[PDB]
Amino acid sequence: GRVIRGQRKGAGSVFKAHVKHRKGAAKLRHIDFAERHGYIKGIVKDIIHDPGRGAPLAKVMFRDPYRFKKRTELFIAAEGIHTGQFIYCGKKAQLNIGNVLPVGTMPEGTIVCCLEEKPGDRGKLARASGNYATVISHNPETKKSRVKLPSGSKKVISSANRAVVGVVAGGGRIDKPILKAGRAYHKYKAKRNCWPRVRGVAMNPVEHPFGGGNHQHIGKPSTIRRDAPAGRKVGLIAARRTGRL
RNA sequence: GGGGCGCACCACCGGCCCGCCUCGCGACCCUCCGGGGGGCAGGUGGAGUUGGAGCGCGCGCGAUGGCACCCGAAAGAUGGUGAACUAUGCCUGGGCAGGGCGAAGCCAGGGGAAACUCUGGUGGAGGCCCGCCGCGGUCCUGACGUGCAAAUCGGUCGUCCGACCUGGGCAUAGGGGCGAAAGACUAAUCGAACCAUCUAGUAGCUGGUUCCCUCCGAAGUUUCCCUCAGGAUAGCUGGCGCUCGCCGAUCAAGCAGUUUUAUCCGGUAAAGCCAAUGACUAGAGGCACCUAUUCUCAAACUUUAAAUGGGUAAGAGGCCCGGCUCGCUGGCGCUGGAGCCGGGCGUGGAAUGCGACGCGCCUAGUGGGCCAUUUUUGGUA
RNA sequence: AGCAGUUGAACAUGGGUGAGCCGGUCCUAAGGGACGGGCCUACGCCGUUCGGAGGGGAGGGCCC
RNA sequence: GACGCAAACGAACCCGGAGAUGCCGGCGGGUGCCCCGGGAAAGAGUUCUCUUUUCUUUGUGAAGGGCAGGGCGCCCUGGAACGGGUUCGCCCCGAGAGAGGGGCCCGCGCCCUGGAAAGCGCCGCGCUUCUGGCGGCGUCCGGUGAGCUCUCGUCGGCCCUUGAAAAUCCGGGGGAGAAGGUGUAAAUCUCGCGCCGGGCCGUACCCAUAUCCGCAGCAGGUCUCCAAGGUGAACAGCCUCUGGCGUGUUGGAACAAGGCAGAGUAAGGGAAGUCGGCAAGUCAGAUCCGUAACUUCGGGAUAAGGAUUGGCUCUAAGGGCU
RNA sequence: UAGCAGCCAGCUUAGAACUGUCGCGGACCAGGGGAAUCCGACUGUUUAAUUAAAACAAAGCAUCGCGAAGGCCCUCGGCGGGUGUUGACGCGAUGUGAUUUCUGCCCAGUGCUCUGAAUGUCAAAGUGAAGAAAUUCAACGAAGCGCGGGUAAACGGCGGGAGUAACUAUGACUCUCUUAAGGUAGCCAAAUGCCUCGUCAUCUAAUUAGUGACGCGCAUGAAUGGAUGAACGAGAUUCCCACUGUCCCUACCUGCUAUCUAGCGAAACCACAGCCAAGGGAACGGGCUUGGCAGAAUCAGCGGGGAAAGAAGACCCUGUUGAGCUUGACUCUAGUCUGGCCCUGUGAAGAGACUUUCCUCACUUACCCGGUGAGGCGGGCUUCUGGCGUCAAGCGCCCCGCGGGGCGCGACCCGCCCCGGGGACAGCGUCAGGUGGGGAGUUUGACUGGGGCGGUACACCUGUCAAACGGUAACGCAGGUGUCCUAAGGCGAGCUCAGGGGGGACAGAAACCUCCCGUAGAGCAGAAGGGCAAAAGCUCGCUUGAUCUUGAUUUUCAGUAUGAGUACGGACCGCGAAAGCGGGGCCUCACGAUCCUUCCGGCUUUUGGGGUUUUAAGCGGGAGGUGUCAGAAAAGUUACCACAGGGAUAACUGGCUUGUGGCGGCCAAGCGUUCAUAGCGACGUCGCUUUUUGAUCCUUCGAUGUCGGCUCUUCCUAUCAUUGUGAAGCAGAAUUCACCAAGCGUUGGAUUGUUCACCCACUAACAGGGAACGUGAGCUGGGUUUAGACCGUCGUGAGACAGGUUAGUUUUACCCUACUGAUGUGAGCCGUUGUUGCAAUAGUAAUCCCGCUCAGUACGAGAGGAACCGCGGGUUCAGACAUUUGGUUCGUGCGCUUGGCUGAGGAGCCACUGGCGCGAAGCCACCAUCUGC
Numbered sequence A: 001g002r003v004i005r006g007q008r009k010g011a012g013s014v015f016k017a018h019v020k021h022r023k024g025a026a027k028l029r030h031i032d033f034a035e036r037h038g039y040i041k042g043i044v045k046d047i048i049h050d051p052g053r054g055a056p057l058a059k060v061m062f063r064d065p066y067r068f069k070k071r072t073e074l075f076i077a078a079e080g081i082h083t084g085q086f087i088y089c090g091k092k093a094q095l096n097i098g099n100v101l102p103v104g105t106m107p108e109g110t111i112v113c114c115l116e117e118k119p120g121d122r123g124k125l126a127r128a129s130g131n132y133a134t135v136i137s138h139n140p141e142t143k144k145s146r147v148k149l150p151s152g153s154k155k156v157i158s159s160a161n162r163a164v165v166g167v168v169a170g171g172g173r174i175d176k177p178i179l180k181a182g183r184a185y186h187k188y189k190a191k192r193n194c195w196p197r198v199r200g201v202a203m204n205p206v207e208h209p210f211g212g213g214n215h216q217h218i219g220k221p222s223t224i225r226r227d228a229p230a231g232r233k234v235g236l237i238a239a240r241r242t243g244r245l
Numbered sequence B: 001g002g003g004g005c006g007c008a009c010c011a012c013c014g015g016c017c018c019g020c021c022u023c024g025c026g027a028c029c030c031u032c033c034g035g036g037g038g039g040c041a042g043g044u045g046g047a048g049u050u051g052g053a054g055c056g057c058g059c060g061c062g063a064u065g066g067c068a069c070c071c072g073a074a075a076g077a078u079g080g081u082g083a084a085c086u087a088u089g090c091c092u093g094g095g096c097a098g099g100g101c102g103a104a105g106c107c108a109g110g111g112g113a114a115a116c117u118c119u120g121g122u123g124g125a126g127g128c129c130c131g132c133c134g135c136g137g138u139c140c141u142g143a144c145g146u147g148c149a150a151a152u153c154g155g156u157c158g159u160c161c162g163a164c165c166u167g168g169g170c171a172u173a174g175g176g177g178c179g180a181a182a183g184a185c186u187a188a189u190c191g192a193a194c195c196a197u198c199u200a201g202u203a204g205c206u207g208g209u210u211c212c213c214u215c216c217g218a219a220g221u222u223u224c225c226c227u228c229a230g231g232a233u234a235g236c237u238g239g240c241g242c243u244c245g246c247c248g249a250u251c252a253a254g255c256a257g258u259u260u261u262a263u264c265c266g267g268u269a270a271a272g273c274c275a276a277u278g279a280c281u282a283g284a285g286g287c288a289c290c291u292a293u294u295c296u297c298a299a300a301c302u303u304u305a306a307a308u309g310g311g312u313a314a315g316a317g318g319c320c321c322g323g324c325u326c327g328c329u330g331g332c333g334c335u336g337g338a339g340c341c342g343g344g345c346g347u348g349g350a351a352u353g354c355g356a357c358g359c360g361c362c363u364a365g366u367g368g369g370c371c372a373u374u375u376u377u378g379g380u381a
Numbered sequence C: 001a002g003c004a005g006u007u008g009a010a011c012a013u014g015g016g017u018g019a020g021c022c023g024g025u026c027c028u029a030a031g032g033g034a035c036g037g038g039c040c041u042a043c044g045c046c047g048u049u050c051g052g053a054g055g056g057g058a059g060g061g062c063c064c
Numbered sequence D: 001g002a003c004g005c006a007a008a009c010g011a012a013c014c015c016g017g018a019g020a021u022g023c024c025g026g027c028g029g030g031u032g033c034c035c036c037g038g039g040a041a042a043g044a045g046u047u048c049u050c051u052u053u054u055c056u057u058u059g060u061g062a063a064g065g066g067c068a069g070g071g072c073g074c075c076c077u078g079g080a081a082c083g084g085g086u087u088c089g090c091c092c093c094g095a096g097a098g099a100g101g102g103g104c105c106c107g108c109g110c111c112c113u114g115g116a117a118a119g120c121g122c123c124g125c126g127c128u129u130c131u132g133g134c135g136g137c138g139u140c141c142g143g144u145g146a147g148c149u150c151u152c153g154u155c156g157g158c159c160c161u162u163g164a165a166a167a168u169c170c171g172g173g174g175g176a177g178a179a180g181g182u183g184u185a186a187a188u189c190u191c192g193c194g195c196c197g198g199g200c201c202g203u204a205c206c207c208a209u210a211u212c213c214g215c216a217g218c219a220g221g222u223c224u225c226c227a228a229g230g231u232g233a234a235c236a237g238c239c240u241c242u243g244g245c246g247u248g249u250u251g252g253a254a255c256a257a258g259g260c261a262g263a264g265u266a267a268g269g270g271a272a273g274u275c276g277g278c279a280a281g282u283c284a285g286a287u288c289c290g291u292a293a294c295u296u297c298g299g300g301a302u303a304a305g306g307a308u309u310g311g312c313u314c315u316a317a318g319g320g321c322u
Numbered sequence E: 001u002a003g004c005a006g007c008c009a010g011c012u013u014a015g016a017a018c019u020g021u022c023g024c025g026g027a028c029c030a031g032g033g034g035a036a037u038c039c040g041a042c043u044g045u046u047u048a049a050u051u052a053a054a055a056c057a058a059a060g061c062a063u064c065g066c067g068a069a070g071g072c073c074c075u076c077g078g079c080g081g082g083u084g085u086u087g088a089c090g091c092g093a094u095g096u097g098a099u100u101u102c103u104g105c106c107c108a109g110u111g112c113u114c115u116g117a118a119u120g121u122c123a124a125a126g127u128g129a130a131g132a133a134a135u136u137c138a139a140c141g142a143a144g145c146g147c148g149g150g151u152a153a154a155c156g157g158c159g160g161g162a163g164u165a166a167c168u169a170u171g172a173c174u175c176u177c178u179u180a181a182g183g184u185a186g187c188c189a190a191a192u193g194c195c196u197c198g199u200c201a202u203c204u205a206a207u208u209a210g211u212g213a214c215g216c217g218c219a220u221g222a223a224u225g226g227a228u229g230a231a232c233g234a235g236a237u238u239c240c241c242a243c244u245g246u247c248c249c250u251a252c253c254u255g256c257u258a259u260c261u262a263g264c265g266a267a268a269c270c271a272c273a274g275c276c277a278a279g280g281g282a283a284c285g286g287g288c289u290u291g292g293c294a295g296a297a298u299c300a301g302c303g304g305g306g307a308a309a310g311a312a313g314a315c316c317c318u319g320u321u322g323a324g325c326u327u328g329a330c331u332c333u334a335g336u337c338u339g340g341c342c343c344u345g346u347g348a349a350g351a352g353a354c355u356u357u358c359c360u361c362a363c364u365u366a367c368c369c370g371g372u373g374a375g376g377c378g379g380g381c382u383u384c385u386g387g388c389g390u391c392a393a394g395c396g397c398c399c400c401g402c403g404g405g406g407c408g409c410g411a412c413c414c415g416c417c418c419c420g421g422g423g424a425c426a427g428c429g430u431c432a433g434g435u436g437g438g439g440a441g442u443u444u445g446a447c448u449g450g451g452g453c454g455g456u457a458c459a460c461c462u463g464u465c466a467a468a469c470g471g472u473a474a475c476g477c478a479g480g481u482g483u484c485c486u487a488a489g490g491c492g493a494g495c496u497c498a499g500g501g502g503g504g505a506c507a508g509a510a511a512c513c514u515c516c517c518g519u520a521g522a523g524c525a526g527a528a529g530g531g532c533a534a535a536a537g538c539u540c541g542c543u544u545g546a547u548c549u550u551g552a553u554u555u556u557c558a559g560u561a562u563g564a565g566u567a568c569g570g571a572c573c574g575c576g577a578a579a580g581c582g583g584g585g586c587c588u589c590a591c592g593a594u595c596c597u598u599c600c601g602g603c604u605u606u607u608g609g610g611g612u613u614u615u616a617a618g619c620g621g622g623a624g625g626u627g628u629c630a631g632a633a634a635a636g637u638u639a640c641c642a643c644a645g646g647g648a649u650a651a652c653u654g655g656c657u658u659g660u661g662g663c664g665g666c667c668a669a670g671c672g673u674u675c676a677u678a679g680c681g682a683c684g685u686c687g688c689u690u691u692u693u694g695a696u697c698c699u700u701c702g703a704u705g706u707c708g709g710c711u712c713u714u715c716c717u718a719u720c721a722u723u724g725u726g727a728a729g730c731a732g733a734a735u736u737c738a739c740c741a742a743g744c745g746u747u748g749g750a751u752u753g754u755u756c757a758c759c760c761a762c763u764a765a766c767a768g769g770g771a772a773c774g775u776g777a778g779c780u781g782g783g784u785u786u787a788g789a790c791c792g793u794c795g796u797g798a799g800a801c802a803g804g805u806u807a808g809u810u811u812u813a814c815c816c817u818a819c820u821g822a823u824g825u826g827a828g829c830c831g832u833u834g835u836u837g838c839a840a841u842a843g844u845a846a847u848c849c850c851g852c853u854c855a856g857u858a859c860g861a862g863a864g865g866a867a868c869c870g871c872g873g874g875u876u877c878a879g880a881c882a883u884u885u886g887g888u889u890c891g892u893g894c895g896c897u898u899g900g901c902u903g904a905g906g907a908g909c910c911a912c913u914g915g916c917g918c919g920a921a922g923c924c925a926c927c928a929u930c931u932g933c
């Protein structure tokens, strides 16, 4: 047979991202002496819509401490901020919405967003619209903390990872039901070439391990092992259980 | 008319060499420690030996390896070239009459005790409707069907503000691409493109295989084979000879799809079942059986038993006589037996026919058969 | 030039395209593709704003 | 005061603007085209009868100066409820309406320089390869429109769609520096004008029922711009003017059969034809009435089912300006 | 002041009068409608060149993986690349397919997944012991497998049999079997129901259709989604209204062709060619045989034939030919998981032995990741606002000409890595084990009354077939075998069996004792045949001839091997007093090459430059086995299919055959009230026919187009009707049987694709067939019979269905005959030319019914009820014809009229015939009329 549609997505020919009209990479300010021993003042200039995601981005303009220049940072717009307000990033920053203070200096039960996995990566966890991570507990002995990622998994990260307080804007976006296939067409036309998903049973055995047969049955257990080769690993990969639940 | 040496060659019997087995176990001069021999004889295996025949070259033919008598596959592999068509994505541009229903919002007038309602107008929403260009291609299964056209033409028809149509520039390249998924599309080529090469790929399979005359002349059957459209093998065929007889039974002869004479073999036709095994009808006698009878049968039953047919014997390789040899045999140097040697005896001791279809070598084709008289199996035929 | 022709996109002999202000040239879009580095036995390939001691213009008379 | 004056020094560095933003809808300003009124001028057409008739032609470039017109969450005064202003729709106001007076932007419209000398229209004379030249007159006065396009604005609508980069150019912040000491100097965003230069390549023609592709002068295929009068809702169909053409690789004479097509027509019956109402036949625009079962209350729906429609002569209603 | 005057400007709406032939969206433009069923929600998309659909997509719903050292995926490769300018409201992988309403039971099987070294199996490396060593042995022992748990919106699955309620019936209720659960809610003869044209109702004069119901449903059923559904559809289906040449039943007109002509001018095709009947033949000739017969050269048609052209059949079989694809095929592989070694160093703690192994925690410098313009690391001064922040003001000190310059503090000092996060773990290199249709290569026996399924007739044995030597075939017949036996082998001795009769306590038809008869009629391991009585059977006691060896030889045979046998020679033995017998079974069957492994044997060989010892090799003989049995290591599918071929071989016709089907006789038990034969014919039996279906496989696979209908012609008779007759259980009428006889006619419809059926009416009757199951270059494609798709059942799957359902290119004649018409042709010319005729021969045509009268008569008890002659019409058919009626009308004849055009009137034109009304002439219709012996 030939290669399945899933194998062709790794080549990156027509399945690359559509990043022409995107406004940049949303990431926190790189950690420097100002964010380690104090705080830096920044002004929110504009809240723009990034084509491809459901969460707005804020263009916060800080002041460079070593040269006469004003840096522009493209943050994740936490729900509640507005243009013209001041955002303070650093250790000594107060516990307000929008500020970027390390998780080690936050009380237990804080709602953060754009959390950092490791110190310096400029914000990875809890970055989609309406999502957040809660700080569960601290540990001054091992300099570690425990946060609750939006997937429900409790991850143990360092106490120096910075995060934006407050939930991400654009919450409740998945509540409005898409009514037309055209709204789903324009939804993915800005993300990537992945929308029309042809079922494996609707294909021939050459293109998919589920195709073929005078009926449209699967014919084999859809639950597939994890060590299955690329080309066979379709359906339910390493399914611990199935059913309605 | 008699005798003899006998070529080549054939049949048979011996000698010797090598392997192996068995019996002799060892006295004896080859031993210098170690050792080597000890006619060993009797069977047996060998592509041996007992007075070489090979080598070289040339020619003919046959079976092989090779492109291999010529033309032909569907495929496989290596290396390249294509997204001017088409599929999807990206960048940047262009384009889509005229009408219809008419949503939120708003204004006004009425009803209310509040909750809130009713009428008109406004507004111009929509993968909304009729519909032109566009873009598609339903039906007539129309036209055309060596056409205008290697897919077109006419009427009709789908859609036409959205998942729309479209140009250019870019991206993905062959077991790869791409696919709102038809195994579709990827330059008229796609259930794996095109170009060149390996490649004159292989074919037990179709087709063809070129001058004349003379002579001989088949096989579709046996055995083995992942064989049953093919091979191997035997048979049938041809060629080259060769050993003789040629002289006729001057000669030995021998042979025969034939008879005669003589002697054996068989269990089919017929016959039998009142004889056995098995099947079977009917009375009668004696106290369901029992006896003597009776009707009807056998391919896997038979007492008996043909016709046709099969084998063998019809002479010198015989017949007869004498002597000798033996470890075999044993009352019995002959007790058998067999071998060896010598001598005596043609009226070649049935008919007919014929040179021996004698001794070898090489060998093509064939290995699908079909029909008839009689015999006969399966089948209604 | 599927009949013809005194005709032609045929044949023969000559002639014809003039730019500071039309466009190319210039810019980067998708994208292609060097450099550093890595990789490949190799021809070469991967990768593209990241990565090398990657700065050869500007100013004050020798500084930056 | 918005901001205006011909100019009106200024580095490093910084900040910002323009380049540079979608689709759709409504409205308004301006051109082009069309139309109407001159009982307008110059030629032509018609005249059998009528026709002060019918047809054609009546002009201004870029750039600059001025002025209409359009736009503005631009300024000052002032202060709002009996709330007012205002659009087709909206929208606006104590974070300051209405009103009064100003500022700026766009002006592709009009006047002027250009510029009538030229261009068209008409008339006359000279001339027949210098001839293939010289003269005369005219180029006018208004109107609007649910008209059609283009364009500039403006207010909205839609998105789980937010609808490009860079060269290049400009403004501001910044005040490092430079200029002369009593008439000039530094510096000038020409600030009025003058001087010099602008190389290289493409440029003809066809652009499709005969210059491209499909073996061809192939009923196929191939990206765009301009686009008139009448009927009509229409860029539909039919007819006409500008422009183009000879009927699409041939003429002539016949009008048999049989075909293709005209979606030709038909007595009485009306699907009895046929696998099957295949085929084509009925219906069709618009106005006024009237519209069920069912339903997700959106629809069904142009449901179904009726009436009216020409021509001509009138009447009534719907405007603007002084 | 309930506003007026003047002037200007268009374009619409409403009402009314009048008027033309009731014509007016007048041309043009331009929805037929209604009641329901099936499927898909809708818009969209799709097989460029046969399938536009119910298929794909879709929103909605649900499951699955993954927190970045990650999920998914790419690359030969860089810890390179895609999702990712991403971060669970995200990305990746699947099923379902809107909304409404629901989504039941089963975790045994397969698959996924979790648990765990707490017990089996378990590689490389390492560790231990023996040994000169190679080597052998033992312990240890990862993932995976095994054990256990979970999971079905994972693949999937979801049963049988009796009794029983006051007639009958049903079986609530019980009984039994049985699982892993035994189909729940629903729905249905459904696109799913073989039987089947189910049954009832409805729809029609009539319905295999449609719809509503019924449900033990071959084989419905719940996200392999069930039920329903407004709107929507170039989807499938039924009925109704309107409409119409679809039809009854065809006719007429027009344009472009065909036709003729000037010019121009091909191609497919072609063995030679072209009249038929029959015969034979390779079983359907054009040519051959026997007959019919046969006259130049051509035009327009035509579709009977040339088993016409197009194309080495696509179906079928064969090939030791392929390809696509799928798995539980065979053999491998990328990837992935796992362990040892490696870069890999350092410090410490604990527990088993005496420098150490296991595990854990730490060190940073190897290694790895992240951040930045490597901007403040380690050790002793900004939170009230959508301002501003740029190379230092100041102080100290120094150097030059009031003008310049430089330095330090401001801006603390020291340092070893830029700062963080891991860290000798990730990772890399290399072996090892597991997983691995993701991918690669290949295989997937043969025989065979086609192949497949079945069978083994594939290696063997008995009787028969087999025709009296031997041999002799078929998917001939009746059978048997892949074993059994330390005795059932060998030998010696003794004994006599099967059965029957007479007897004998319990004891009987069967126990045991005994006498008599007993040719074997018993037994001999098995199938059968043969053989056997002091045996070969039975019993008993001694035994290992069931051993070791060379050759000869029989049988299958090629006269090869193996297997199975026979007779001897040489050893060593058994039994017997002995002669003798015995190297397996009473005989015919019971079995296996090369290579390799293994064991036994040597009075032995090599291990090579010698010697010694291990090891290995070799010679001789067994065993391990190839049952496809002279011996490959091997699962499917293909309807997406390809190639080489095959009429060696199936599906059509034809041919032979006629079981079967159909049809007709013979005999006469009996039926017929009585009477065998008016009409029938049981038990038997003899034939015909090729309109049934088989059997066969001769023709055809470098192709004979294939089911039905439509259309049209002709023949046959085994006669339904009509004509002429015979017979009766013929009174009449009606009907039945039979004869001469195919001249003539044999219908319109509902349902079904149907031939075949069934019903509705009509009728003199509505007979049965043939002609390549007549007839596709005649048509129609409904059916079947490619590719799309749906369901049911089956398969793990790809896929299958002789089951259902929907959409699916029907090509060419101009050649030669045949036929239909149209010119012309004997040419030999005193013949040329014309008129009027004759006639061979060929075709041939009429058919049937009704009404009146006979007649209410014959006849009959009645009820009922004819016929001939004559008269008047009609059905079907045939040949004509246009006076009349009707159709057509581009005499474009006349009138009218829509839009536009010529300035208007008048007169006209344009819109491929603008439209409408009427319409001459022609042509035309059982739609008018006339004739038919």
Ligand SMILES: [Mg+2]
Binding pocket: A202, A203, A204
């Ligand atoms: Mg499919």
Ligand SMILES: [Mg+2]
Binding pocket: A209, A210, A211, A212, A213, A217, A218, A219
């Ligand atoms: Mg499948």
Ligand SMILES: [Mg+2]
Binding pocket: A216
């Ligand atoms: Mg499905």
Ligand SMILES: [Mg+2]
Binding pocket: none
């Ligand atoms: Mg299944």
Ligand SMILES: [Mg+2]
Binding pocket: B076
């Ligand atoms: Mg191969």
Ligand SMILES: [Mg+2]
Binding pocket: none
């Ligand atoms: Mg656009």
Ligand SMILES: [Mg+2]
Binding pocket: none
């Ligand atoms: Mg509608």
Ligand SMILES: [Mg+2]
Binding pocket: none
């Ligand atoms: Mg259209």
Ligand SMILES: [Mg+2]
Binding pocket: none
């Ligand atoms: Mg298409």
Ligand SMILES: [Mg+2]
Binding pocket: B137
């Ligand atoms: Mg078409």
Ligand SMILES: [Mg+2]
Binding pocket: none
């Ligand atoms: Mg057609």
Ligand SMILES: [Mg+2]
Binding pocket: none
């Ligand atoms: Mg034709």
Ligand SMILES: [Mg+2]
Binding pocket: none
């Ligand atoms: Mg394009």
Ligand SMILES: [Mg+2]
Binding pocket: B176
């Ligand atoms: Mg690749």
Ligand SMILES: [Mg+2]
Binding pocket: B180
């Ligand atoms: Mg598509």
Ligand SMILES: [Mg+2]
Binding pocket: none
């Ligand atoms: Mg398919």
